[PDB]
Structures are given as C-alpha cells and as structure tokens.
Amino acid sequence: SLLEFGKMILEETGKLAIPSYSSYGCYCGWGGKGTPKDATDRCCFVHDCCYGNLPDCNPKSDRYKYKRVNGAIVCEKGTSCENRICECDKAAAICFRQNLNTYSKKYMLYPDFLCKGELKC
Numbered sequence: 001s002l003l004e005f006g007k008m009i010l011e012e013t014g015k016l017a018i019p020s021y022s023s024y025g026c027y028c029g030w031g032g033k034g035t036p037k038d039a040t041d042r043c044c045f046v047h048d049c050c051y052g053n054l055p056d057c058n059p060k061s062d063r064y065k066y067k068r069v070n071g072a073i074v075c076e077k078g079t080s081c082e083n084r085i086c087e088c089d090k091a092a093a094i095c096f097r098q099n100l101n102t103y104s105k106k107y108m109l110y111p112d113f114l115c116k117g118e119l120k121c
C-alpha cells in the first residue's frame with residue numbers, strides 16, 4: 001500500500017515520502033510524462049513501470065508484509081499481487097537510498113508543463 005511504501009521510504013532514506021517524494025520531478029508521487037529529471041526521478045519512473053506490470057493488482061491499497069534481515073528488505077509471502085507490489089516498492093526504496101547523493105529540492109513541486117513526451121518502459 002501507499003502508506004507502507006511511505007514508511008519503507010522513510011526507513012530507507014530518513015525523508016518523509018510526503019513531501020520529499022510525493023511531487024518530485026516528473027514521475028514521483030504522480031508520474032505520467034516527460035524525461036525524468038534525475039536519478040531519483042528515474043527511480044519513480046521505473047516504479048511506475050513496475051506497477052504498470054501489474055494491471056490487475058491494486059498497489060495503492062493492497063497491503064503486504066516485509067521484514068529486515070540485517071538492513072535488507074525481505075518481502076514475506078502473501079498473495080501474488082502483494083509479493084509483486086512489495087518487490088516494486090523495495091526496489092524503489094533502495095533506489096531512493098542509492099540516489100540520495102543527488103536528490104535536489106528544486107525538483108520538489110515540479111511543474112507539470114516541464115514534463116512532456118512519453119518514455120517507454
């Protein structure tokens with residue numbers, strides 16, 4: 001679910017999903033179009049594609065379970081949709097951590113009109 005993803009993001013990065021990643025660039029918190037602005041935005045682009053791989057799943061509301069082994073995220077077994085959702089979120093959270101070094105506040109509340117064009121998954 002979105003709230004669980006938000007908790008995962010905070011755990012991983014120390015940033016609040018809202019407002020750090022809810023309106024960032026072209027794809028974070030509300031993707032759609034344009035060339036991703038930076039590596040963080042690309043995390044959200046891939047995350048969006050990842051959810052797009054699951055048309056018959058409901059990633060916003062469906063809850064999954066995960067644990068930490070060391071600091072590593074381990075998705076626990078639930079339904080097929082839950083497992084696949086968890087893997088998408090895990091990847092994104094790790095991606096955000098990997099790219100904290102280039103996270104830029106200037107991409108927060110990024111205006112829609114600067115995001116144009118379709119980019120294929």
Ligand SMILES: COc1ccc(C(=O)O)cc1
Pocket residue numbers: 002006017018021022027028029030044047
């Ligand atoms: C509503 O909260 C969020 C938080 C993060 C993201 C994201 O990282 O894409 C989307 C919505």
